Structures are given as structure tokens and as C-alpha cells.
């Protein structure tokens, strides 16, 4: 195939020059797990147990003893296929385009196959990432525009059935109000028995400011992570900061028993076999990528919202 | 690499074209060798 | 490859029966020089050098000498892909085709790969010849709706900042003005110290049949032809002179050195018909082909072409 | 037509036609009819110089 | 090439589990063979003799006497070629689309490429086996919208220049007024000495029931159909009689003769569903394939075939 | 050549058309060494 199809082995020599996506920090290794699926949905079973009498002392001879039932619960998940086509120079007429220096041509905007590649890449890894964090897709700052996307498929920060904190207009420069709220939501998050985990909380650039000014000598942000740890049982508490996000909070468990992703395998981006050629010495190729697959508990997710106006 | 040749075998598009050329060029000088003005 | 493109493998079976063209009598084996390229501009630089001073006499100790001076000059040429496409039969449908004596569709116009390929190559091959010469490119015998070309791209009839001479429509059939005007053009030609060098000259073949006339009271032993080839001699001291006939022009005289230091033709490697690897396919039994080709590449020196028009208006 | 430029994106190219003429000729029969004497009465018309009316 | 064609591997593996066509069962083996033609057409030329005039008596002198002609017939048979198109699922896309027990997708009636072909040459072999039955290509059951066909291009029921009778509207009920119509064809048919072959007969589910009623009291051991057979042995020389039923046909009854030198089948070679080699290919999963067959070639002579048509009015 | 015999190998589609025209008519002709009416 190497010899044959020189597309396929130009994307496999540069395939190492994509640097890894930054949604892989925002879980923990154990709550990532790959499926096999590019378009559908697929049904995930969860069983549990319980205890339906106190236990039996067996003494003596019995014959009537206390029972253990089981549960389950099905949850679906949906997947979707999406796809870029791009331009770029065909193999055969590169040499003609081979200057010193540099490879394609500048007046045209035309590049090799495998640089190609790589940027249109990076640039869907972004959109995935994005997608992942948010749970819509959009290409403008201000996020309208959004492609319809399919039920079933959400992001940390539309996911339904978690908690939701709104901070008023009037008070979008307080952060003992916005403070408030987040103890409000935290108060509100019910964790069970995986409470004993590592936290992560998200902010954007905004709220990562005033999150540094001295508390009303002390910060903000050591009184967000002393709280967080009086819930989490003392354990490690993380803070990203995201040019995603606006005017937002998320705060979620590190934990695989209460979220976790479950990506398709092909979800990164992937050429297609199909190449259009024609008699001039342009060549268009087609990606593919596949988004949806992110699982959660109900009320484990706080999601606090600062409105503007 | 010339198309008169037989010992020749092309492995791909690039390299057929590289021959066409190669002929023509042979075929020019040929006909200067043989031009008798 | 052969094994798999079948119209490659029918390309180099019939790339032998094409005929080589016309234009290389047009040029000596030194002047053709081929490059690399398909499409954009390509530069040459020119050196000289000049003296400054009289040479320093070495007598004694001195540590004052003339000195050499240098200069440069710069040339861009311009070159332009051009392709064409054709339709033929489908490889694998030959056989319900072929007849007793012929092999193709007569009601349909439509032959085989290899005999569509030769005759799309001649008609190529005639068009580039064409071009080389005339420096235009154009299917109309009337010359117009040209195909608008780059500059920096001339042929050996239109090239800038040379000789023209016109002979005026009364003196259409008077070769005594005729060669008044070719000698003035003769005598503006500046060779510089290149003069040493064959000549060639290509006339139209009316200008060739009043050539052969006996030279005028019209005299004896002498033709028109031999005047021209003395007058050509005079310039040339004493070298070769070559006259050729071409129908591509038309009460036209081009005379030129054939000297590669003057005139030198730069084409690319490219420059005859290629064939292009998409071959477009369908479920009937018709496809199409396409054939590629590179134009321009003519470098010269001002003031060495002389170009003598017969006016008939 | 005249020949396409090559340059970024097209697929409108110019076109090489090709024509079939088929050359035709033909053949007549044509015939003339003469009179003569019948080959058993040429003694009745030798002449010492000629033979014939 | 089945190492780099999967569409061509899963042909050769699945062109065993497509039937034979129906049609076979309708001639001998001797009336079967196949002409080496896409499109196009055969000639055949035959001689004929014809008297102008009564005889010429002679007594004493006459030297005007009556003239026997002669003429020549060129019987011509047209080929044509046909194509459909059909959907189905990439190769490399199946994984994503098998089930539990099946392979395609229901919700958008996509299919894998060896169902799809063996179920779209199932369907273009009985339009054949229609066209050669009836001689009209068509998809309607009310037999409009037909498409136009060459001439000289016939099935065994609109084949011209052969008995047809029809029974009238009010009596399709009386099987003997049928029978008369059926005995009147068949003294009118014209076997000449090639009369002594096995016959064949095709009828309708609604006949077929019919036949099996007792011959008219009525008779007590013989049937229609034995009459029928008797009838046909009169005339075929005590020859085999053979009886089929097709659904294709309404309310017709068709008689002829099994015999190679008077109904010949000459079928193209290729006439029977093709695989053709292009392949539409996108970026999705759905891929585009053709197949091609060819259609003609029945040769008849004149008043051979009795065709009955029973009015439904 | 015919596909019923599976030592055949097909180099190209012309032969494979080939081969489904002849394995149709070897199917006619057991078709009717098999009938009997």
C-alpha cells in the first residue's frame, strides 16, 4: 500500500508531528475508554446491587434467608460522523513547486499533501476540543451559527440534569457573591460514596483574573481550593484556565464510577481513501472525525454562569 | 532511460515522462547528426 | 506500469511514428539548449568585463595599477503550459469495432487510442512550429481571436528592437527594390564581433519561385539567389549562407546568424506533446485523453534579426 | 479551439475533433456495336488489292 | 484481478445462486444459438420464385410466352445494448453496517454489493424472459409508456404476418367457442414439409383451468386438454405436444412449432446480465454499479405461429 | 475458461466477461441435459 497509495504513507511519516489534544487534561487516564463505532448509537448497561434485609445469623438450622437484588440501567449514546475536504498540490507535479526554502506555492496559497494534512489536523483537533468542552460546534467567537447536533450528545457544560448556579448582572464583578454561589452549587453536588477523589475546576480568562486578587493575606483561589478539599476529602484539586469558555464555572470529580468519556476510536481525525484528480495539478482530500460519547451522573457537575447584562 | 530502448521498464507515470523527454532529445540530436544541409 | 496502464504502453509503442519537426532545420545543433521548467520565468545572467586604463608599464617598484572593471546584465523568459483534450475509444471495447480492413466507428468519429494520440500529437506539433516561428498562437488562417500570451514571450518574426524593412505594395513584384530594401536591412544588422558565423535565411515559397528567376536587361549565368547569397557573403565574410522555404510565411524575408553566442532557443524539456495520466472514464465506451505542452523560450540579441515585409494593399 | 492555460483549478478544457471521409470510385461499363462482312463472303468481295465493298 | 477487484471476486461468487431464465423451457436446444454482437444487426438472404402468368401453350408459332420471376428477401435482425444503474454499500464500509444476523442497512435500504447485484440481475432477467415472451419492454402493469425499440425486433407474440384469432367478449366463458378459434388456426397455419416437429403450447393460469374440464352430456373421459393434443397431433404428425403455463400472458394462447428451421433464437452472447467495470466512488459510504445486457435476435417465418386472444370486454 | 471450474484465474475484466459468457451457456446446456418433459 506504501508503494502504491503515497498519500497513505505521506500521512503515516507526518502523523507524529500532531501535537496531542488539550481536552486529555481535563480527565484522568482511567476515564477514557475507546469504542468501535463511526455513526449510531450504542447502549451502555450499568447493573448494580442492593441490599433488600439486614443479614441472616445462621445458628442452629434456617431455611429463610435475607436477599440480595440487582438493578440495571441503560443509557444511549450517540455518535456523529462529520467531515473537511481541502486542497492540495498532487504528488506528481510537487517537483515543479520544490523551491529552495520553502515547498508550494505562496502567490496561490497551494501546499504538499502532507503539510496539508497536518495544519487542516491541528485545526479539527481545536474544533474537537471545543466540542468536547462545550458541546456545540461553532467556528465564530461569538458562537452563533451553531451546527444542530443530535440528542444524546453533550458537552461538560451543557450536560442536562446537573447543577446550575447563575450569578446575577448586577453582581459580575463581586466574588463574594459569585463565591456564594459556587458554595451554594457545591453544597448541592451529590458525590455518594465517590466522594474520596480529585476535583478539577474550569474558568475562563476573566474569572482566572479576579480569582487572584486578596481575599475580602489570602486569595480567592486558596478559598475556592480549601472548599472544594473540605468536600473531596482532602484530596488533590485542580485549576485550568480556557479561552473556550466565557463568563463560566465547571467544577466535576476526577472519578471514572461517576463520568466518563468513552470516545469512538475513530474520533480523531482520519484521511479518506477517496482522492479527486483531475488533468491540472490541484488534488482535494477529505478528513473525517466522529464526536459524541461523553457519560455522566445526574447532579455531579456544577456549572456556574455569570451573567452579563 | 530513453523510449527507444527495450531494456527499459518504466515503474511509474514520472518516470515514463522523463523517458518521452529523453527521446525527443535523442531524436533531435539524431536528426542534427544526420542533417546534411 | 505497462503492465497496468495500457495507454502508456500504447504512448511509447507509437511515440516513434510521430515525425520530428520542422523547426529544427531553423537552428544549428549549439543553439538548442533545453531546461527544466513547465510554467514560470526563468532568469540568465550576462558578465562582461571592460578596461579602465592603459596597462602599467612594469619597470622598477610600482604599486599603482590599472584595474579590470565588471558588469552585469539580466534576462527573463517566460514560459506557458498549455494542454488539449481528445476523445477516443474505451480500450477494452476494440473488439466490437474492428473490421475487415480498419479498426474504429466511421458513422461516429471515433478510432483507437494509439492512431487518436499520432494525429492529436501532429496537429500539436504543427501548432508549436507554428508559434516558434510566428511568435503567435492562433487556429484562424485570418490570424485573429490569438490566444493572449505572457510577455517575455516572443518568436523569431516579432521579437522587439530588430531590423523591419517594408517594401511598398507598388514595388510587389520588383525584386530590384526588393533587394534594395534587403540590402539597407543588411547593412543596419550589427553582428559587433560575432559577424564570423553561417546565415539562414527563410522566405515564403512566392518569394522563392521570383528568387529563381535569372538576374536583371535581364543578364545570364547568374540568379537572383546568387545576388542575395553574395550580398549575405559581404556581411558574414565570407561564410555559409542557408535558405529555406516555409509556408507558415507569408511575404516575409528573415534573415539571421546562426551563431549560439546571438541566438540562442532556451525550450523546456517539456515543450512536445505529453501525455497526461488522467484518462477520464465512464460506463459507455468513449474516453478522453490529454496532451500537454510548454511554449516559449526564444532568447536573442537586439538588433540581429532583419525582417523584410512585402506590402499589397 | 485554441489550447487552455493550466492554472490552478479547471476542468473546461479545449477540444481535438477527428473526422472519417470515406473515397468513393466508380467503374462503368460502356459498349459499341460495328457492322462487318460475315467471315464465309469475304471471297465475293477480295479485290487483287483489297478485300471489302 | 480478483487480488485487486472485490467487486469482480464477489461476482464470480455469487453469479452461481442467479437462476436460469424460464425462457429455456420454451425451445429446444436446437433452436438456440449465440451470435458474437453487442449492437448492430445480422443479414440473411433468401431466393424465392413466382409465376406472372398461365402457361403458354405451343402450337404452331409463338414467341411471347408467360415469365416466371424470382426475388430476394433480406431479412435483418437488430442487437441492442441496455444498462441500469444501482446503490449500494462500500466494501470498506460493510463492517459498520453488519447486524446481528444481516448485513445493510434497513432504515435506508442499503445493501452489500454481492446482494444487490444478484437481486438486480434477478430483476433484469425477468424483464428478458418479458421481452422475449412478448416483444415490448415496458414496466407497467397496463403495458404503456413502453420504449421504443428498433425494428425488426419481435417477441413470439407480436412477431406480424401470422395467424391470430381472437374470441369475441361475450363468449370467454365457452371453452368450445375458444377451441373453435383454436381449430380454425390451426387448419389456417402453414407448416409445409418441416410439419413434422414437436409443438409447443403456452397458456394462462385462467385457460389452464379451463382445459381440465370434461369434453363436451359431457364426456366421461376425456378432456379439453386431451382434445387439444389430439388436434395438435393431427397436424404435427403424431409428434410430442408440450403444455406450459405462464403467468406472464393474459387471457392468450400461444401455438408453435419446436422446430430449428422454421423458428430460430439467435441471441447475442452477451445478451444475459454483465458486471460493468466502473465504479462510482465518493467520500460516503454509497458506491454506483452498472450492468449491461443486450436484447434481439428472434427469427420466424410467415404464418407459423397461432396466436389466440380471448376478449375480456 | 469458465467459472465453474475454480482453477480458472481471471488476468483481466475482458477475460472475466468472457468467462461469464461461456459459464452462462454451459448452464444453458446442462439446463437442458436436465429437462424432461
Keep these: ?309 | 532511460a530513453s523510449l527507444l530502448d527495450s531494456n527499459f521498464v518504466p515503474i511509474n507515470f514520472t518516470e515514463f515522462v522523463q523517458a518521452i523527454s529523453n527521446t525527443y532529445k535523442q531524436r533531435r540530436i539524431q536528426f542534427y547528426e544526420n542533417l546534411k544541409r
Excluded at chain 1, 95 to 115: C, E, M, R, V
Excluded at chain 1, 230 to 247: C, F, G, M, P, Q
Aim: hydrophobic content about 40%; proline content about 4%; glycine content about 4%.
Design chain 1, 1 to 309: 500500500l506504501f508503494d502504491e497509495n503515497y498519500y497513505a504513507k505521506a500521512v503515516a511519516n507526518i502523523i507524529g508531528e500532531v501535537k496531542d489534544p488539550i481536552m486529555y487534561k481535563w480527565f484522568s487516564p482511567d476515564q477514557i475508554e475507546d469504542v468501535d463505532l463511526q455513526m449510531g448509537y450504542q447502549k451502555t448497561v450499568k447493573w448494580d446491587a442492593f441490599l433488600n434485609a439486614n443479614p441472616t445469623t445462621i445458628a442452629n438450622e434456617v431455611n429463610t434467608i435475607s436477599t440480595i437484588g440487582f438493578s440495571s440501567e441503560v443509557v444511549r449514546l450517540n455518535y456523529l460522523k462529520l467531515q473537511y475536504k481541502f486542497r492540495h498540490l498532487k504528488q506528481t507535479s510537487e517537483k515543479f513547486y520544490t523551491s529552495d526554502s520553502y515547498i508550494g506555492d505562496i502567490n496561490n496559497n497551494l501546499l504538499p499533501f502532507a503539510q496539508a494534512y497536518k495544519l487542516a489536523s491541528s485545526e479539527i483537533i481545536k474544533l474537537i476540543n471545543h466540542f468536547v468542552l462545550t458541546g456545540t460546534v461553532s467556528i465564530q467567537k461569538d458562537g452563533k451559527n451553531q451546527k444542530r447536533l443530535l440528542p444524546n450528545m453533550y458537552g461538560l457544560l451543557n450536560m442536562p440534569e446537573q447543577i446550575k448556579e447563575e450569578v446575577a448582572s448586577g453582581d459580575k464583578d463581586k466574588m463574594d457573591k459569585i463565591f456564594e454561589k459556587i458554595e451554594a452549587g457545591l453544597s448541592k453536588l451529590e458525590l455518594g460514596d465517590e466522594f474520596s477523589t480529585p476535583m478539577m475546576v474550569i474558568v475562563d480568562p476573566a474569572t482566572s483574573l479576579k480569582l487572584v486578587k486578596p481575599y475580602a493575606c489570602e486569595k480567592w483561589e486558596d478559598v475556592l481550593i480549601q472548599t472544594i478539599k473540605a468536600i473531596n476529602n482532602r484530596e488533590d484539586v485542580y485549576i485550568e484556565t480556557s479561552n473556550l469558555l466565557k463568563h463560566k464555572i465547571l467544577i466535576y470529580p476526577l472519578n471514572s464510577e461517576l463520568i466518563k468519556f468513552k470516545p469512538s476510536k475513530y474520533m480523531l481525525p482520519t484521511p479518506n481513501e477517496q482522492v479527486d484528480k483531475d488533468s491540472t495539478d490541484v488534488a482535494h482530500s477529505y478528513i473525517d472525525f466522529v464526536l459524541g460519547g461523553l457519560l455522566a451522573t445526574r447532579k455531579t457537575i456544577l456549572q456556574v454562569n455569570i451573567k452579563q447584562s
